[PDB]
Structures are given as C-alpha cells and as structure tokens.
C-alpha cells in the first residue's frame, strides 16, 4: 500500500497512488476519479464531493467551496474581498483570518477555509483508502506555483487536520511534468510549457528540467479564467433564450439558473468529444420544460474571446522566461477545460502545429505527479535502482576485438548493471579513415574463443599515424543486460554503434 498524492483545486480535486511503475487514479463513491472541492453543510451532516455539488442549488447558502482562494489569506486581503462578494455563504473577519459561516446541524458556526479543505482532503483520503484497501497517511498535496508561504503552510495544515502526514507541498506544474515523465532523466536541458486551464483559474508556467532537477522560469495567468466562465457564457445563451422563448425571467431564480448551469456543464463536456450537445430540463422554471441545444461552433462563438485570451498569459510567460516559441520543447496540458478542441487548436497552432502532451487526462495529471512524488518521498525507492544493480550483473566480461585478435574488456564480469564504461583506442595501423569494432562476450583472451555479439564500423576518423586518433569506445549496458556498444572519435564528434540482444637450497649449505 503506497503513498498518495492529492490534487486540491478550487472546483475539483483528484487522488492517485503510485505503485508498480504507474499511478492508479482512484474513483470516488460514484466512479468519478475527479470530484468537486465542495462541502455541503446541512442540518443532518456535511456532504463532500459530488454529493455537495449536486445540491448547491438547494443549499448554496450553506455550501462552501473554492476554499483555496481564502486559504492562507488575511481577511482584509483584496482577494478575499473580491471573492466574498461572489459567495452565497458569509465570510467573517475573525482575527483577520476569514471564516465561513454556514449552518451545520442547526448552528451557524464559522469554519476556517483550512478545515474546509481538510474536509475535502479527508474525503479524498477515504476514497484512496477504500480503493487500496489500506489506511493512508503518507501524502503529497499540490498547490499553485504562485502560492506564498502562508498558503503552503495552510495547505499542510489542512492535511494534518485530515490526518495526513504531509510529506510535501509541491507545485501543480511540477506535478504535471512528473506525470508526463519529463523528470525520468535523459530529457534534461528542456523547456516545458504548462498550460493550466481549470475551473476558476488559468495559469501558465515555464519549467526547465535538467535530468530530474527542476527550475521554474516564469509564471503568468488569469485568476478568473477557467471552465466556470465558459459555463457562464453557455448559461447566458440558455438563460436569455429561455426568457425570450417563454417570456419568463429565469435569470432571477437562482435554482433554475443553477439547474441550467449544471446542464451547461454536462453539455459542454459532451460537446468536447462531440460536435453537438443538448439541454433537456423538466419543469426548469415556473413549471416550464426547457428543451434546447448548443452546437460546438456556437459554443466556440460564445466563448471565442475566452479561448483566445488564454494565449495572452502564454505570451507573457514566454516574455518573462525570455523565450521564443522555438525554445519550448514540451507542450503540456493541465486542466479539464483544455479538453475543449478550441483550446488544443489554439495552443497547438500558436506553437506551430507541435503536438500537445495529452497522454494523461488533464485533470488527473497533477494528482498523478503528486502520487509519484509521494511514493519517492515516503522512502526513496521507485522501481529502482539498487535492486537492479545488485540483482543484475554482467555474467561474463564484455569487450571488443582489437588488433592481434584479442579481447579488451570494458565491463568486468559480475559488475553491476546498468553501467557505462569506457576506454581509449586508436586505429591500429597508420592513416586509416575509420575502425572496425567487434563486440564480444566471455572470459577468453582470444576473440576466436569468445561469443561474438555483433560488429560495427566507426567512420569519421582523420587519418593519422597509428596511435594518434583518439577513439572512445563505450560499453553501455542496461539493467536487463542489453548492451549498446558505441564508439566516437573525439577529434571530429562522429560516432556509430551495435545493439546486442539479451540472453535472459644454497642458504642451507657451506663453502
């Protein structure tokens, strides 16, 4: 039972566990891997996840969600003031630490945002535990890259309230890069652009990865751009339509609008795989059955500026990172809203047709990375490296035929693998343009008595007297015994290779 990582968002969250080289992303009670960052305080119990989201229209005044905007902030913080004007619940200046007042079991208790998010984390904890069949406290929680230190501590504390051992707080874009394997090494010295288009926010972050070591070069964003306003444009389409079609002003009924919005969310998600989606609500407003539709093209028109504006922070991030388009090697998507074809088309066209990394569901990639990181942090073994080195060795020395018909070993018998070993060779005779390397396995001095594994030619060698050209021959062996023998001439940079397949007295006298 491995450590887990939790993707703690403003509108949604997701938990995964890392094991057997992969992260298993875990479904909630209804089969949903990603569930809402909502807690509904009712007079009987607090519902968490889909259960809270499903009743926002009925109990919005007591349902608390998007705790993150308030977490780690002071009551007087302009952000706090900006968001409290948008909530159905009351935000309270309890010592400049904004609390939310909702009725729980009949009492108008003020709940601090860290406990609201711990309620969410506790639910995510329970989801992963039910799946894994084991209680789990070892965890990584992700946060936006822009979070400051009061916010990071606040996130750790929400974890502690929930009973978690917070191994670490890591950034959302780091986790995505991890999820896509950009930290597996051999992919170093690359720039990664992460496009984080979520529910209530949009962020862009440019990372540089050097063989597993990360640096963040730049960030940019729009703190109010995300799926929620794509939903609001779809809502205005349907709300104004309803009113005009029926001469009934639905916009004034918070529940009817929320039912319409829920349909907007469903239709929009459907629309992203489709070309068309519909709205079908019985008795939506004043007993009126509202049946209508949205096409993909209409959706894009409604939201045409919301989509185009996502590239403005892209240009900003590139400016801050001092990078041109050509300097981004890896294009990465984060957030369910990037599943809309228009987003993919805009980012991909912006970067001249280059393919986006869509290999992991955008809403799972962050949790995925957190889970991988949680597993290494709980104890630093992650399908490597010491077992590979101690269990698998080169069973026979590995080397090459050299002049004289003899074998020169570069990898010694029973040496641990994976490993890379080298030696310097020159052409045997004078003024040759290249060399012939015969790769062998075995313990005999002569090559005629060894196992020929394969042969290759190293070209690009300036002719010079014997012993002058400097050729480095490398025996590069992986964990499974596969051998790659390469060679290069250090004076020209030219190289070639062969792939070898796997087997698996006087002093006592006087005068």
């Amino acid at each position: 039972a491995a450590a887990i990582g939790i993707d703690l968002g403003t509108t949604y969250s997701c938990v995964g566990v890392f094991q057997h080289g992969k992260v298993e992303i875990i479904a909630n009670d209804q089969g949903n891997r990603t569930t809402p960052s909502y807690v509904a305080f009712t007079d009987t119990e607090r519902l968490i996840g889909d259960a809270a989201k499903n009743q926002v229209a009925l109990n919005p005044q007591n349902t608390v969600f998007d705790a993150k905007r308030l977490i780690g902030r002071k009551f007087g913080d302009p952000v706090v003031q900006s968001d409290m004007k948008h909530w159905p619940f009351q935000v309270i200046n309890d010592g400049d630490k904004p609390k939310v007042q909702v009725s729980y079991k009949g009492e108008t208790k003020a709940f601090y945002p860290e406990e609201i998010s711990s309620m969410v984390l506790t639910k995510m904890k329970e989801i992963a535990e039910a799946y894994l069949g084991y209680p789990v406290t070892n965890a990584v929680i992700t946060v936006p890259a822009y979070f400051n230190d009061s916010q990071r501590q606040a996130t750790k504390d929400a974890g502690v309230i929930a009973g978690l051992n917070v191994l670490r707080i890591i950034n959302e874009p780091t986790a995505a890069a991890i999820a896509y394997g950009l930290d597996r090494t051999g992919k170093g010295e690359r720039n990664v652009l992460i496009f984080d288009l979520g529910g209530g926010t949009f962020d862009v972050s440019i990372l540089t990865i050097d063989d597993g070591i990360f640096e963040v070069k730049a960030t940019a964003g729009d703190t109010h751009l995300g799926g929620e306003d794509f939903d609001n444009r779809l809502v205005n389409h349907f709300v104004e339509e309803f009113k005009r079609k029926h001469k009934k002003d639905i916009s004034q009924n918070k529940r009817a609008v929320r039912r319409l919005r829920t349909a907007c969310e469903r239709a929009k998600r459907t629309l992203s795989s489709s070309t068309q989606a519909s709205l079908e609500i019985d008795s939506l407003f004043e007993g009126i059955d509202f049946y209508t539709s949205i096409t993909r093209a209409r959706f894009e028109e409604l939201c045409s500026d919301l989509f185009r504006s996502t590239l403005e922070p892209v240009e900003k991030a590139l400016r801050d990172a001092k990078l041109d388009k050509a300097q981004i090697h890896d294009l990465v998507l984060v957030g369910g809203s990037t599943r809309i074809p228009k987003v993919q088309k805009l980012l991909q066209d912006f970067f001249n047709g280059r393919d986006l990394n869509k290999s992991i569901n955008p809403d799972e990639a962050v949790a995925y990375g957190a889970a991988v990181q949680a597993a290494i942090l709980m104890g630093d073994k992650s399908e490597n490296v010491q077992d590979l080195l101690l269990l698998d060795v080169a069973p026979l020395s590995l080397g090459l035929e050299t002049a004289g018909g003899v074998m020169t070993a570069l990898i010694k018998r029973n040496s641990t693998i994976p490993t890379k070993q080298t030696q310097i060779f020159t052409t045997y005779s004078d003024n040759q343009p290249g060399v012939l390397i015969q790769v062998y396995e075995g313990e005999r001095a002569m090559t005629k008595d060894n196992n020929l594994l394969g042969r290759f030619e190293l070209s690009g060698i300036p002719p010079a007297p014997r012993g002058v050209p400097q050729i480095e021959v490398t025996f590069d062996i992986d964990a499974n015994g596969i051998l790659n023998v390469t060679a290069t001439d250090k004076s020209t940079g030219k190289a070639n290779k062969i792939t070898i397949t796997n087997d698996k007295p006087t002093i006592e006298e006087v005068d």
Binding site: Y112, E114, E115, S118, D157, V160, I161
Partner: protein, 132 residues
C-alpha cells in the same frame, strides 16, 4: 508534598553523558529549548483548528526569553500546550527509552550531541550548562 521519581535508565545515562562528556557546542542548549517550545505551540495551534477552545486560556502563541543574571537564571516561556502532572512524570512527555537508546547507539557510533533533538530527547541537553 513533593513526589520523587527515578529517571528511566536510558535517560539517567543520557544526562550523565551530557554533563560529563566534554561537548564544546554548548549553544545547542538554547537552540533545543526554543525548538521544543515551538513544537508545543504547534500542538495547540493544530488542535485549535478543530477545537478552538484550546486557545480560550490565552490566544497568544509565542516564546519568551528572560535572563536574570543576579539569580544565574534564564526563563524560557512556552505558551504552547504544556504538560499535565502525568506527562512531567512520564519523561516530560517523550518516548525516552526508544529515542535515547537509539541516540546512545548513535553516540557510540560517533554522533555529536547536536543530534540529540533528532531522537526526540532534545530537552535533556538543558544540562549542558544547567546546574539545575
């Protein structure tokens, strides 16, 4: 009425080592006591997140240092959770035997006294400079 208790052997030995071993880095004295006060302050702060009444006895969580040279003394005040009679008796609230034994083994292996806090027995370092 004053109750007298024995120290558990692992710590009776630890305190002897602190006093009699010639450790030069006496400054860890203050470092460890301040650090331990921080832990106590967090214990309340975390409980106050689900049970705010823990702060009803005093909302301020802080560390005070107050020297009084004329009495050869320094007071360190931890406004954190504190200890009940039972915790004071039970090794000032720690797992003294497992922590200290592992530490003594670490010391036998060449560990410095500065590592005492890494075993959760950091407060016994008070005797580096304290008479009492």
């Amino acid at each position: 009425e004053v109750e007298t208790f024995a120290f558990q052997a692992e710590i009776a030995q630890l305190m002897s080592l602190i006093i009699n071993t010639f450790y030069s880095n006496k400054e860890i004295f203050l470092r460890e006591l301040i650090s331990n006060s921080s832990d106590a302050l967090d214990k309340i702060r975390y409980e106050s997140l689900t049970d705010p009444s823990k702060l009803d006895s005093g909302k301020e969580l802080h560390i005070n240092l107050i020297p009084n040279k004329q009495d050869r003394t320094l007071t360190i005040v931890d406004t954190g959770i504190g200890m009940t009679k039972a915790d004071l008796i039970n090794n000032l609230g720690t797992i003294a035997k497992s922590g200290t034994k592992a530490f003594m083994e670490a010391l036998q292996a060449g560990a410095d006294i500065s590592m005492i806090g890494q075993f959760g027995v950091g407060f016994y370092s008070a005797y580096l400079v304290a008479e009492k």
